[PDB]
Design a protein around this nucleic acid. Sequence first.
RNA 1: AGGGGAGUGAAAUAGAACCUGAAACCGUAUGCGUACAAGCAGUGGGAGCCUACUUGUUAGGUGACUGCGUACCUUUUGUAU
Lengths: 103, 117, 200, 48
Amino acid sequence: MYAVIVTGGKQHKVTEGEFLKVEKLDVATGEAIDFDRVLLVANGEDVKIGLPVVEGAKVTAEVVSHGRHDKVRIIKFRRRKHHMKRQGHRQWFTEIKITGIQA
Amino acid sequence: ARVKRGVIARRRHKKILKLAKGYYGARSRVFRVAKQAVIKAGQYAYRDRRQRKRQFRALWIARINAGARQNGLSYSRLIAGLKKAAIEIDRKVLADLAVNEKAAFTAIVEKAKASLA
Amino acid sequence: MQLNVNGAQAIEVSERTFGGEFNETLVHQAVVAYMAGGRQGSKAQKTRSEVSGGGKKPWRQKGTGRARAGTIRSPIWRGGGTTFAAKPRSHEQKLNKKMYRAALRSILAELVRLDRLVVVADFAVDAPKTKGLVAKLDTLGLKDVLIVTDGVDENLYLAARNLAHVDVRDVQGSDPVSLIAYDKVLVTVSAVKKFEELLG
Amino acid sequence: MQLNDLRSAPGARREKHRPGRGIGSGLGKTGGRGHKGLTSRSGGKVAP
RNA sequence: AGGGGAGUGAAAUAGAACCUGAAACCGUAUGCGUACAAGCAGUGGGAGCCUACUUGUUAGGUGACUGCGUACCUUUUGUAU
Ligand SMILES: [Mg+2]
Ligand SMILES: [Mg+2]
Ligand SMILES: [Mg+2]
Ligand SMILES: [Mg+2]
Ligand SMILES: [Mg+2]
Ligand SMILES: [Mg+2]
Ligand SMILES: [Mg+2]
Ligand SMILES: [Mg+2]
Ligand SMILES: [Mg+2]
Ligand SMILES: [Mg+2]
Ligand SMILES: [Mg+2]
Ligand SMILES: [Mg+2]
Ligand SMILES: [Mg+2]
Ligand SMILES: [Mg+2]
Ligand SMILES: [Mg+2]
Ligand SMILES: [Mg+2]
Ligand SMILES: [Mg+2]
Ligand SMILES: [Mg+2]
Ligand SMILES: [Mg+2]
Ligand SMILES: [Mg+2]
Ligand SMILES: [Mg+2]
Ligand SMILES: [Mg+2]
Ligand SMILES: [Mg+2]
Ligand SMILES: [Mg+2]
Ligand SMILES: [Mg+2]
Ligand SMILES: [Mg+2]
Ligand SMILES: [Mg+2]
Ligand SMILES: [Mg+2]
Ligand SMILES: [Mg+2]
Ligand SMILES: [Mg+2]
Ligand SMILES: [Mg+2]
Ligand SMILES: [Mg+2]
Ligand SMILES: [Mg+2]
Ligand SMILES: [Mg+2]
Ligand SMILES: [Mg+2]
Ligand SMILES: [Mg+2]
Ligand SMILES: [Mg+2]
Ligand SMILES: [Mg+2]
Ligand SMILES: [Mg+2]
Ligand SMILES: [Mg+2]
Ligand SMILES: [Mg+2]
Ligand SMILES: [Mg+2]
């Protein structure tokens, strides 16, 4: 059993009991969230192709933690023009655990 | 008050030479050559964060194209049908179903043909 | 405005001297000016002019294959002179008389508000003996104290000359920095009145 | 009111800018003088 | 000449060219890669192997194959030049 959900502008293929990192969500740790924006759900040999959203299908999950990704370094250099800039970046994420799929 | 540069100059060279680890020859052990390699490696890293998004989309398209023709449809006729019916699944998820969930990809393809496109 | 005396009653000192505002940016300027005026500038280095030797061209201008040089005591060279060598000078600033007096009127007012100014009747000690002044200061319960009097006694100055955190000073010799540095300040009633006729 | 507690008002003291120390400072290399010419050299002053 | 023990010392990798003792440079040992392959030597992707341990959505080393990619400074209308 797997499904396709939408979160953080991106789409994810999701099966029950799977950990993944999505964009930061405005939810504390430990609570429960519902994804009503479900594009496809499959259960073995029965696949419900989702016209834009499957009717009534939803996915349950809980927040595990928040954090930041590894640092990336930005360097802007223009040769023999006496210019240089530097910057760093760490992107926020949220890790969720899937604990329910039903169409 | 006379200031001696020996101690802060050494820490500044060592930061550059640590980033140049794994490079070839003088690019990993002399500061002058290693500084340019570290700057150039940061230009490529900035630029290839953009190409990475282009190169993966071209890879997903080439694989939906191969998967659609096994079902009797070209890539461009599939996308026209998918937009026509309602379906709005990504190219990243479509390319994943083409390889692994071939029976789910078949249902989506024959849904796009049934849209008379 | 009342200043409490340790044994007598309050002595009704003028509002302006004790009890004005704290002009922090003016006390900083008066403190900085005092420290800059207390340093002697006695240092010097040698320019390329006054390092010994180096009066001839080491080699001809062209044809050798070396960079152009004009003397061996150049700032670029190892034994050469300093580029901007130092000479003795003075770090003396100007502070107006009325800016200096205003700063003392801010320090004195702030000490009373911080309960770190102690006012007593006449402070006198007989015979110069550091051991005897130590006993007398603990009756007031003081450790790190500056003593300000209308005129410093000879006996009082000879004692506490060796005592570690105790300094004895005159009213007209008490610099702004001392009134901030010591944990407590001890002034006689006659020394309070002397402050009134200078700071207004 | 301690000797390590007092400070001057904001805007009453600036840092003084030193030309010729790297790219990020905005005064590196030519030091605010432009490119070649008389008014870019030691003692390169135009008489009043 | 220089060394291997033994003694002195808190410490001889403090042993007389003797406190600390960096970098260029030169070696030995182990792991992985490398003899059909063309270029500023990197980066995006990425298999396999080796080690460690919380036994694989982990950490470290290597990098077959592959897309893109002609150093830095200065002076110039303009430089891989
Ligand atoms: Mg260049
Ligand atoms: Mg240096
Ligand atoms: Mg390498
Ligand atoms: Mg090295
Ligand atoms: Mg001589
Ligand atoms: Mg001379
Ligand atoms: Mg001469
Ligand atoms: Mg010199
Ligand atoms: Mg030198
Ligand atoms: Mg000298
Ligand atoms: Mg005067
Ligand atoms: Mg004393
Ligand atoms: Mg520079
Ligand atoms: Mg600029
Ligand atoms: Mg200018
Ligand atoms: Mg110039
Ligand atoms: Mg010109
Ligand atoms: Mg120039
Ligand atoms: Mg000019
Ligand atoms: Mg010219
Ligand atoms: Mg000149
Ligand atoms: Mg040692
Ligand atoms: Mg030696
Ligand atoms: Mg010693
Ligand atoms: Mg040694
Ligand atoms: Mg070494
Ligand atoms: Mg080997
Ligand atoms: Mg061949
Ligand atoms: Mg081969
Ligand atoms: Mg070759
Ligand atoms: Mg070649
Ligand atoms: Mg690579
Ligand atoms: Mg990579
Ligand atoms: Mg690894
Ligand atoms: Mg490559
Ligand atoms: Mg190429
Ligand atoms: Mg040049
Ligand atoms: Mg030219
Ligand atoms: Mg030309
Ligand atoms: Mg070339
Ligand atoms: Mg070249
Ligand atoms: Mg070009």
